[PDB]
Structure formats: C-alpha cells, structure tokens
Design a protein around this ligand. Structure first.
Ligand SMILES: NC(=[NH2+])c1cc2cc(-c3cccc(OC4CCCC4)c3[O-])[nH]c2cc1Cl
Ligand SMILES: [Ca+2]
Length: 223
C-alpha cells in the first residue's frame, strides 16, 4: 500500500497473508474454512496465516493453516487477468473471534464514489521496494467506468472496476495482490492489477466480486 496508514493490530480481522516461506499475496476470509484471493496468486505449498499484524513476529492471535485445495476460476485468462479470482479451502477450520472474522459477500455491486478500505503488506514505494512488517490500510473510492476505461482503454472487462486516486500518491501495489477491497462491510473487490503503483492517472484495477457470488456459493457448496 503506497500513501496508506498503519491499520492497527487486528483491526481488519478478515485479512489473511498467503505464505510460501515469505508473504506473496493477501486474501479475505469469507467463512471458517474458505478464503478468496486472486487467481494470479496461485501456487502450491500455500500456508494461510490468519490474525496477523507484524508478519515477521509471532505476537499472538495468529493461526497458520495449510491450504487443502485452491480453485482458480475455470475461465481465468492470465493474459488479460479477466476472472482473476481463486478460492482456497483450509485444511481445518479457523477459530473465529474478534481478531479472526469473516467478511460478507455483497448482495449488490457498489457504485462509483463508494469509499472502500483496501489493506495489505504490499510494497509501500511506487519507485522501489519497501515491504512493511505490519498491515497497511488505504481508504479509496470506486471510480466511474468512463474514467476507468479512459485510463486503461481496451483492458477493462465487465469483471473489473477501478478504485483509487488519479492524482497518484495513494494506491495498492504488488504484495497487496489477492487482498480485500471492502465497502460498507461487504467484500466488493480483489486487488488484481494496475500500471505501476500510485502513478498519476493509472488507478488500481480490481476483480468485481459481485459478479462471482453465485459462482463462489456453488463452488463452496460442492467442495
Ligand atoms: N493498484 C495498483 N496499481 C496495482 C499494482 C499491482 C502490482 C501487482 C503485481 C505486480 C507484480 C507481481 C504480482 O503478483 C505476483 C506476486 C505473487 C504472485 C503473482 C502483482 O500482483 N498487482 C497489482 C495490483 C494493483 Cl490493483
Ligand atoms: Ca505475526
């Protein structure tokens, strides 16, 4: 997160860190045994780390659970990043409490201007790499589809939306990938892609979760 602030320990209880010997992507807990992340964060050997604040220090509240299976969307396209969503089933259910809790899936899509919270342990510099130890937060609005398409002509599908600031300075970045975009208490987006981080007129592009709720529900129900 570039231009964001320290969230505060466990203030984002649905935030998870996907770890393979180091933090590589974020994710969101949607129930005690399932997490939603981005398809481009897929790899084998994933350990899901819940209740984390400093990812390099065991401070208490952490639950480390191995992923039993990861389900990348069948129509995921790695060239366009269209359908960039993946479901990870945990080997055992997590113990939910005030520090580890799930986030609700949306019943409707959000509108432009809706302010959302994006969080993660991704890079905090736009020019260079600085990864943080604790969780960073950024409040950002969903942009209108004309502004989004004008920024990325020909690259936005109906399963994506842009959020952020066209003036640059505040944005999500690599490492925040797969993590949550929460608006009014509902998971509306997944950190997917953008041109650089916090560059002027190049907002972040997010997977539009409201278009996948029946898919998530049917897939969970059958696995
Ligand atoms: N807000 C933005 N401008 C932005 C920037 C990046 C940058 C990435 C990104 C860059 C390099 C590698 C990535 O994933 C690899 C690391 C782990 C597996 C795939 C990214 O997600 N994702 C991004 C997502 C966004 Cl929304
Ligand atoms: Ca920790």
């Amino acid at each position: 997160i570039v231009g964001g602030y320290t969230c505060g320990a466990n203030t984002v209880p649905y935030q998870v860190s996907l770890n393979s010997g180091y933090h590589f992507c974020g994710g969101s807990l949607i129930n005690s045994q399932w997490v939603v992340s981005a398809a481009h964060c897929y790899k084998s050997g994933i350990q899901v780390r819940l209740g984390e604040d400093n990812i390099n220090v065991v401070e208490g509240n952490e639950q480390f659970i191995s992923a039993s299976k990861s389900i990348v969307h069948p129509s995921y396209n790695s060239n366009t990043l269209n359908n960039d969503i993946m479901l990870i089933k945990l080997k055992s259910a997590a113990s939910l409490n005030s520090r580890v809790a799930s986030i609700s899936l949306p019943t409707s899509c959000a509108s432009a201007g809706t302010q959302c919270l994006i969080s993660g342990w991704g890079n905090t510099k736009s020019s260079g790499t600085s990864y943080p130890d604790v969780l960073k937060c950024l409040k950002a609005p969903i942009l209108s589809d004309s502004s989004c398409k004008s920024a990325y002509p020909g690259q936005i599908t109906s399963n994506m939306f842009c959020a952020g600031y066209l003036e640059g300075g505040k944005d999500s970045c690599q490492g925040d990938s797969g993590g949550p975009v929460v608006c009014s208490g509902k998971l509306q987006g997944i950190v997917s892609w953008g041109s650089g981080c916090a560059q002027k007129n190049k907002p972040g592009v997010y997977t539009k979760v409201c278009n996948y709720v029946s898919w998530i529900k049917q897939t969970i129900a059958s696995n």
